[PDB]
Design a protein around this ligand. Structure first.
Ligand SMILES: OC[C@H]1O[C@@H](O[C@H]2[C@@H](O)[C@@H](CO)O[C@@H](O[C@@H]3[C@@H](O)[C@H](O)O[C@H](CO)[C@@H]3O)[C@@H]2O)[C@H](O)[C@@H](O)[C@H]1O
Length: 461
């Protein structure tokens, strides 16, 4: 039962609430290490916890790799977004983070630490504003500002540190020295004046991807991403990822989960309790699979429950009810199907002859109220009303699950095993266009006209 419940606070093997807010993760040896920070009673840096696991679901407490006692300036300060990266050359784990006074946010500087072991007590080095010696001034103080940050290890073995500079208006990608403990140069300035925060830098197939969020404090916002063949330049524009609130969370880190089957990228987020007036320690987590439609097209679906099998390297949706179904039209006798039995995103939904194919099988996931999710089997995508249309003739397609109301359907029994499937968005029924009785009939959205082409029978398979 390697299943995770989003919008909650995961508990370690001890039965205690895990506290690794704004943290990250590292895969070394046979274990996945989850680092993160958490405040205390005075809302100040208490320690950077570390959790270990092989299955990515059951986490074991390993103590504070970094404490407010590790250094004199760590006593009264704010530390957030601690990330850990490994150095093959040295053989030591270097840790970066964001440091503040604890009184204000004027000292926008980064901090560094390291240890010979992953779950061992890290030794604090220093806190500083990148390029301090260069003499450059960034808003009153010497050295570039450095708030929200993150680390990245490239294939060639070069380390990289990214953070928000120039009053969170610009993103600075710093290239680290071979030891990872220092900054060698300013690789490139990314997304100037666009004000992107909580950056996550990853790589897949010669393509670099940068997942960022907006700057609105606790308030969840529209997350975005970009791609490029080179870190220095060639970066694309910003493309929306997830919904308008990133499913009520803010991105913190993204790691490739490699296994026997293949590689599945995991998304980590934070549901900051500050949204509803709660303390930082009351923040919950949101883990979702990061799917790659193409080298240039990304998908971030929302599953209320996610199943993970680290061994095989597979991250998919958890269906509470594996019962398969077929939707037969009263008028045509055809069943609900996907065009060309495609698994592509936004694939057109059509009616087709009952051929017992996978494309013609659907799950029914309750999503609160009297509404449900109609999910295809051959492709984990959900039945969706294209472009959240509220008009007659609105085409129906299969789209990535995003909790939108245009993906919620209520079944209304009319007798004899037939139902009227209305959308939660406008209330229009699932309709076979023009009363079509042939294969490939476009499935659409239409007002309840009492037609038999709008009536569907639910059949077990
Ligand atoms: O009014 C709100 C908002 O609605 C968006 O509708 C989008 C969503 O319904 C989304 C799933 O929730 O599905 C989008 O379908 C898009 C399609 O529009 C585009 O042409 O192709 C992509 C991928 O192929 C995808 O299928 C749908 O657009 C509107 O998009 C948005 O403008 C806004 O109106």
């Amino acid at each position: 039962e390697g299943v995770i419940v989003n919008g909650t606070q995961f508990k370690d093997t001890s039965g205690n609430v895990i506290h690794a807010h704004g943290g990250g993760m590292l895969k070394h040896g046979d274990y996945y290490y989850w680092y993160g920070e958490y405040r205390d009673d005075s809302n100040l840096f208490l320690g950077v916890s570390c959790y270990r696991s092989k299955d990515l679901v059951n986490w074991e407490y390993r103590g504070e790799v970094l404490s407010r006692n590790s250094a004199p300036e760590l006593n009264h300060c704010n530390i957030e977004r601690p990330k850990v990266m490994y150095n093959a050359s040295t053989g030591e784990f270097v840790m970066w983070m964001h440091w503040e006074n604890g009184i204000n946010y004027g000292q926008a500087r980064a901090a560094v630490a390291y240890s010979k072991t992953p779950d061992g007590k890290f030794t604090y080095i220093r806190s500083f504003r990148p390029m301090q010696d260069t003499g450059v001034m960034d808003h009153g103080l010497p050295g570039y500002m450095s708030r929200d940050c993150n680390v990245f290890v490239d294939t060639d073995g070069k380390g990289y540190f990214i953070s928000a500079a120039n009053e969170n208006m610009d993103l600075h990608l710093y290239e680290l020295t071979p030891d990872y403990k220092n900054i060698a140069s300013l690789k490139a300035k990314l997304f100037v004046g666009q004000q992107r925060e909580a950056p996550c830098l990853i790589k897949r197939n010669g393509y670099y991807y940068l997942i960022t969020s907006g700057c609105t404090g606790w308030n969840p916002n529209q997350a975005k991403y970009a791609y490029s063949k080179d870190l220095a330049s060639g970066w694309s524009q910003l493309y929306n990822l997830g919904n308008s609130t990133t499913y009520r969370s803010q991105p913190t880190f993204i790691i490739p989960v490699q296994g026997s089957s293949g590689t599945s990228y995991l998304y980590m987020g934070d549901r900051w309790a500050g949204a509803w007036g709660g303390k930082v320690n009351d923040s919950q987590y949101v883990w979702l699979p990061l799917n790659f439609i193409s080298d240039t097209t990304l998908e971030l679906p929302y599953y209320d429950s996610v199943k993970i099998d680290a061994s095989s390297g597979i991250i998919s949706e958890y269906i509470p009810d594996t019962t398969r179904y077929k939707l037969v039209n009263k008028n045509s006798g055809k069943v609900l199907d996907v065009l060309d039995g495609s698994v592509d995103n936004a694939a057109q939904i059509v009616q087709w002859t009952d051929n017992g194919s996978l494309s013609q099988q659907w799950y029914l996931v309750d999503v609160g109220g009297g509404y449900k999710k109609i999910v295809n089997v051959k492709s984990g995508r959900a039945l969706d009303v294209k472009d959240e249309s509220k008009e007659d003739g609105g085409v129906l397609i299969q789209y990535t699950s995003n909790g939108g109301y245009n993906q919620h359907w209520k079944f209304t029994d009319i007798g004899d095993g037939y139902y009227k499937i209305s959308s939660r968005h406008c209330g229009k029924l699932i309709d076979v266009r023009k009363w079509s009785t042939e294969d490939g009939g476009i499935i659409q959205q239409w007002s309840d006209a009492g037609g038999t082409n709008q009536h569907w029978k639910l059949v077990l398979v």
